[PDB]
A paper describes a structure:
The oxidase forms a stable complex with the NRPS and dimerizes it. We visualized co-complexes of the oxidase bound to the elongation module of the NRPS using X-ray crystallography and cryo-EM.
The complex of BmdBM2–BmdC was subjected to structural investigation by X-ray crystallography and cryo-electron microscopy. Furthermore, though both BmdB modules of the BmdBM2-BmdC complex are visible in EM maps, the highest quality map was obtained by performing refinement with a mask that enveloped the BmdC dimer and a single BmdBM2 protomer, because the modest flexibility of the Ox:A2 interface does break the overall twofold symmetry of the full complex. Notably, the cryo-EM map was calculated using a sample in which the PCP domain was not locked into a single conformation, and as a result, the PCP and Asub domains are not visible, despite attempts at focused classification around PCP-binding sites. The EM maps do confirm the overall conformation and mode of dimerization observed by crystallography.
Author numbering:
A (entry chain E): 847 to 1435, 1439 to 1677
B (entry chain D), C (entry chain A): 2 to 324
Amino acid sequence: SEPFSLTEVQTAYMLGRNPQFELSGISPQTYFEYETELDIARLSRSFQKVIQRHPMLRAVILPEGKQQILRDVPEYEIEVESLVSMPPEKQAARLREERSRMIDHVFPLGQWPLFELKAFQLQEHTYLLCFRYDALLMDGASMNLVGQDLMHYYHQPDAQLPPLSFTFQDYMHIYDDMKRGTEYETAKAYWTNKLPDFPPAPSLLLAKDPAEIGTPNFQSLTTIITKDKWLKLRRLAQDKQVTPSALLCTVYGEVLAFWSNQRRLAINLTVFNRYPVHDEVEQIVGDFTSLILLDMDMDQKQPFFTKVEQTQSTLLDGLEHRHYDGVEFIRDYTRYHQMRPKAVMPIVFTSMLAGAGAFAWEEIGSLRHIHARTPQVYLDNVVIEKNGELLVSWNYVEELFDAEVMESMFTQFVELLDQLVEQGDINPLRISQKDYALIDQYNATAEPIPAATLHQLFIDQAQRTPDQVAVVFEQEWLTYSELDQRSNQVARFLQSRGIGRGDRVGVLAKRQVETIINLMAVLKAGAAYVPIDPDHPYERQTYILENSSCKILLDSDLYETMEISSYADGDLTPVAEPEDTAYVIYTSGRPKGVIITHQAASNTIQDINRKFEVNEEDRIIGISSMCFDLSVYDIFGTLSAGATLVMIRDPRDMRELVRTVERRGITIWNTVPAIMDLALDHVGSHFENISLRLVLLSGDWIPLPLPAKINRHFPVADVISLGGATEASIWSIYWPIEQVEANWKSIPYGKPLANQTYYVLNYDQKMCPVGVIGDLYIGGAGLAQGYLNDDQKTKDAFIMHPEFGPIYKTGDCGRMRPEGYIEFLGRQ
Amino acid sequence: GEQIFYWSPAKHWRMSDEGVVIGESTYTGMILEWFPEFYFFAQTGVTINRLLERFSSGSEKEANEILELLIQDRVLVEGILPPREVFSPQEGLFVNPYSEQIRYSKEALDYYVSEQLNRTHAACRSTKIQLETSGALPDIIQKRRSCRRFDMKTPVSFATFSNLLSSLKQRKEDKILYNYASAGGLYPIDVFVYVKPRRVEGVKAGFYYFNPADHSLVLVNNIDQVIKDDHELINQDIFAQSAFSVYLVYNARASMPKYGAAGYFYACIEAGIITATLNMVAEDLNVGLCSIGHMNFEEIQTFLKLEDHQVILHAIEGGLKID
Amino acid sequence: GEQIFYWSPAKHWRMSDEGVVIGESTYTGMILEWFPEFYFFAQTGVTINRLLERFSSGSEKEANEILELLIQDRVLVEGILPPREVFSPQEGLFVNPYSEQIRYSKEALDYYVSEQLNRTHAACRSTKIQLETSGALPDIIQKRRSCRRFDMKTPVSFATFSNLLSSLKQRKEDKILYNYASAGGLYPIDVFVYVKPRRVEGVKAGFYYFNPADHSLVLVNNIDQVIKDDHELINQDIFAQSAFSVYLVYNARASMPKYGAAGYFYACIEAGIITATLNMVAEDLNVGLCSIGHMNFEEIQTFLKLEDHQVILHAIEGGLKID
Ligand SMILES: Cc1cc2nc3c(=O)[nH]c(=O)nc-3n(C[C@H](O)[C@H](O)[C@H](O)COP(=O)(O)O)c2cc1C
Ligand SMILES: Cc1cc2nc3c(=O)[nH]c(=O)nc-3n(C[C@H](O)[C@H](O)[C@H](O)COP(=O)(O)O)c2cc1C
């Protein structure tokens, strides 16, 4: 008649009663409704007799944080109301009111009964008993134990059953004595050693944050698995020497691992049937619930059954260390990993497979309704065996999920079970349906561009407008016909020294008009070029020429020193083909060369010039260094249009950049975001420029506020965001910025430009569901040919996908948004 | 081929305790130590290596710094001076009976202007002949007005632009005739036309030379740009709103060989004959025009690649009238 | 109370062995003993006695003769110089690639002129915009020709005479307006009209001042006369046949206080303006005009009693067209 300590789960039920904790404030509550032919006065008397036989039903929970069996209670009478005279619709109105009320109502602490029983007579021989209880009172095993004795007395009121000799208060005494040593200590050591690397719970594709939910609202996805399928699954488990529990957990794990893009995942597993304690304990009423966590690892190539066996061994060992509660573990874990009072383990698996009796309550009358709510749960996967029927029910908070995702996940679970029934193993989960079409059209970018070669584009434009000025630096400049004559002499010179197709020429990045002449000559003769910045530490300049195996370095002071003027300036015999390397650029110092062919380079240029209608009236400001791939667009992109290129002597002088645009009438800006941002801080409020029509911001992050400064100082310019790789032909992903278009923390990365594709892949290289974060890969015609003189890097970065063809892993992380674009989250 | 520099005729100098004063600046060092001999040599036209040979005899750096400063300060010059330098010395001869405030205070200036508009010649006798106002002037003259506001949306049509320019073309009537009188019949002033992007139909932005014999425009420069900072603030609205502009360039080589200094003078007059003729035609064509008192001509002369004998004497801004 | 003289800005001093050389002439005797200090001292503006005490201290007779010559030779001057003196030094900057024959052989001149009328600019690029010849100019411009012969018997009618002068009169439209532009809106050009006996109806012979504000001619001088010997002989027939002649005079006080030296330059432009305007009206009125580049202005400024601030810039001869 004394108070006793709570089990750790009961302690947790008490803690979870606190509204201050995430998704808490609800001590777990359970609702039941059953249909019988049996009279209430007799069931009511049987109910008090079970209280007399099973005094734990006479328990009260105290505000103290302890439990006590009451000396006694006011005798309980099941209230019975007759709905017999009511039409079925009104009978339902009363049944619905009691069900709704019992589901939302919570038992107060200090309330003597921890249960409530109300019943209706719908017909003289049709009854519906509606009831509820607080979880601190009892288990499900206990609920049917009670139902069995209750119905016994209905039929045989005088067939008096013995009292429990071993009572809950004796049960709890032993509990308090056990938690001192032996198995407690042994289990604690087992768990203590595992705890430091116990995995996190999987992260699901939630629609909403728990803070947006407050009180959870549960719905369900249910199905009954027929006896034949159930027996086939059991036989499979028998052949594989495993329990169906491991079989079910593994299938559940596949669904979760797929959707969350996880390799390892912690699963909240509920432990049933306590510790032995005494000879009569399975015969008494009380709460025998305990927590265990399941450490699952799905990062396997291995067969389904292998994963099941791994799961089985894990389950079996964990249950031998049940003597240390998972509640204690999680307390230690969340303090260990600084998780704070958060809903850390919201995904739970519960099983009554071979863990249920005849269902004494259904022997009394059929189950019509059941509902339960627990704190801090997003989804409870519960499987029950019912006289051979396999009952599967996923109880989930509707507020946290997109209903279509939720239906899809359940559907996949069931389909995996069906495959195990027919084949014995499963097909890896994959997604298509109302998702596949979005990606299918997203990547539908093919266009009829001939590519050809970079110098051919120059040659033809030079013939169309030979007296146009092509390159401007100071008061010195070159025309299109001059570039052809000068580059023809230089190319003959290079050819005459034995430099041919397949060779490489290093060139220096100097601000001289002759730099362009030398650059064109190298390509016209068929050699690829390698740019070097003259201000690189000297040892790096030497490193690159040696590492790249170049034959000669071309300085700018050559025309007058190598007697170039002695050479013919007439037409050259063509050498290069579209498939040849145009250039090799060294990046990411240690640095690797990136091999780019003429076709790839051309297609990017052709698409940009066509999309933005670039023409002979345009002016491009050459701010960017020649050591970048970015400069290819400026040089070749200008020449193919008949446009004018302006060189900048010193890119750091923002005032010079402003002076240049104003004095030269620049129409196209092409920089990394940092330059436009810096240039704009040397601009006063009175400043306005109407010469820029197009601004290309390429690479790096673009601040959401940046367009505001661009738009006010350059009110007529179109601001474009461009992403890509150097391991690809400069640009791959496009997005215009039409002001800040939404309340968001990011600018859409965008969509592919032309003849390019993009994918988001999971940890196993399969497509991620829309909204799921994974690795970013690029495919299509814009790819580089590999790294120069680094085979291991090429091997891992450039791969051949069985469905998508050659793709490049950029290694950036991100996801597709259902809106039709890629959002990226940086590299990590 | 070395550039010859002359003591600029616009500069005078004095000895002082501080140093030597040339124009508005005071100098010390070798330049002081040089005495009139420097002055006399600079006076006849000497190249730098010769001045160093004669006037160095000290550190080369010192000698070079002095000559560089004098060139920068326009003490030593290359050739013929522009009008702003030519008339500069007359400032020391004019004595202003008015306070300086007429150049700072709007009210002081308005007083000045109103008083001057009602002035007469002092040496007059007490008798006069009153003229009648009974006749008439044609609209082409009496209704002309300077415009400072333009239609920035409508481009000047090609035919309009051609017809306005035709006002200065050559005609052949057994000799070359113009639509206006000039010089001794030499017509020593070149016309350059500047067009802003898309403001004139059929013409690309840039600086063009007009050839009156052909009735055509030939591009000289389509790279550089004219900017608002090439104008004084009072005229920046005009700059921003105009469509095109016309520059009048005097060729010393076309006149000086026959008239000497007078040729420069006559060209200064001729510019106003041309200007009036052009404005009359512009009014028939609804083209607004406005004269500019001062502009950054040095930058423009650079853009047009004008030679040593060439100077811009006058410039006019314009476009279709705002309406 | 003495007149102030200034070292003329147009004269450059140098020393030689013979003596002091100023411009074109060499001075000898005591003047050599006056040094560079005379050159410096004179730049600030001096009286004759202040200058004499500083540099004489010996017989004043020699000092007075020297100073008198320097004044007569325009070394020491009292005020603003006329344009013939203002632009004189520019000839030392110009280099002439042509022979002197342009001034002596009419054939050398014709050749010269033909080259000049077919000149093009050196920087022209190989492009071309051909302009339309599809338009027309108003008759007032395209039918105008210089007149070198006049009706010597018919007096200019009064109305014609008055109507021509009216082209430069003031108008009031809530402010004072003219039919032509002026830099700064000051209109600093005074107009004097000279009429011969019995050649202009209603007007007695003499020199008159024209006041645009009154629209009238105020007599200035009916004693003196303009004679043929005041002109270069090439113009003596124009002078002999004309009825009247108009002089344009620049009034420095009407410009210099606002613009400084630039004001004189602007006035030189304005002289082309006005002239062209007048020419157009003369065409409507059937009046012939011919401008003159140079004549004896010193006698004229004496006759008109012009003050120190007044400079004669230009003159035009005319009369009725003869048929
Ligand atoms: C040589 C010259 C230069 C001038 N410069 C300017 C100038 O810089 N800015 C301006 O607004 N007006 C300028 N004007 C003043 C006006 O053009 C003009 O004299 C005024 O509008 C009065 O004449 P109107 O009624 O015919 O327009 C200039 C005029 C001349 C003759
Ligand atoms: C500033 C100036 C001064 C001139 N001086 C004289 C002159 O002294 N004698 C003369 O007969 N013509 C003189 N002329 C030349 C004629 O005025 C006229 O311009 C020339 O003959 C062109 O004739 P046209 O009417 O066939 O076009 C002068 C012209 C200008 C612009």
